[PDB]
Amino acid sequence: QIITTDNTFVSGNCDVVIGIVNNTVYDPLQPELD
Amino acid sequence: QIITTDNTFVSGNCDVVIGIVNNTVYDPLQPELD
């Protein structure tokens, strides 16, 4: 599945996790902000 | 963590639960209403 704000959760900034990768996390809400 | 509508679910009106407390529940939709 696509990485989204629904199938994931945040905790803290990117500095502490020993292996971490840059990728987009999609948000389904803001594409219809109006 | 901040008590949002994503951390929680609703059921009844407040009168039935013994020991319930009054507090705000945050909604992360509210800033996105452009």
Ligand SMILES: *[C@@H]1O[C@H](CO)[C@@H](O)[C@H](O)[C@H]1NC(C)=O
């Ligand atoms: C994983 O292994 C490779 C090859 O030994 C190494 O270059 C890399 O730094 C390791 N990654 C982590 C997160 O330690």
Ligand SMILES: *[C@@H]1O[C@H](CO)[C@@H](O)[C@H](O)[C@H]1NC(C)=O
């Ligand atoms: C990940 O993204 C941040 C912010 O652009 C950048 O500082 C960092 O160097 C990037 N790391 C890699 C491996 O792309």
Ligand SMILES: *[C@@H]1O[C@H](CO)[C@@H](O)[C@H](O)[C@H]1NC(C)=O
């Ligand atoms: C908890 O105990 C105190 C002391 O007896 C009492 O005043 C209070 O009403 C009780 N709270 C609940 C939620 O029953």
Ligand SMILES: *[C@@H]1O[C@H](CO)[C@@H](O)[C@H](O)[C@H]1NC(C)=O
């Ligand atoms: C809780 O909030 C309601 C609505 O403002 C109020 O009627 C009730 O008296 C409050 N109870 C307490 C214990 O603050």
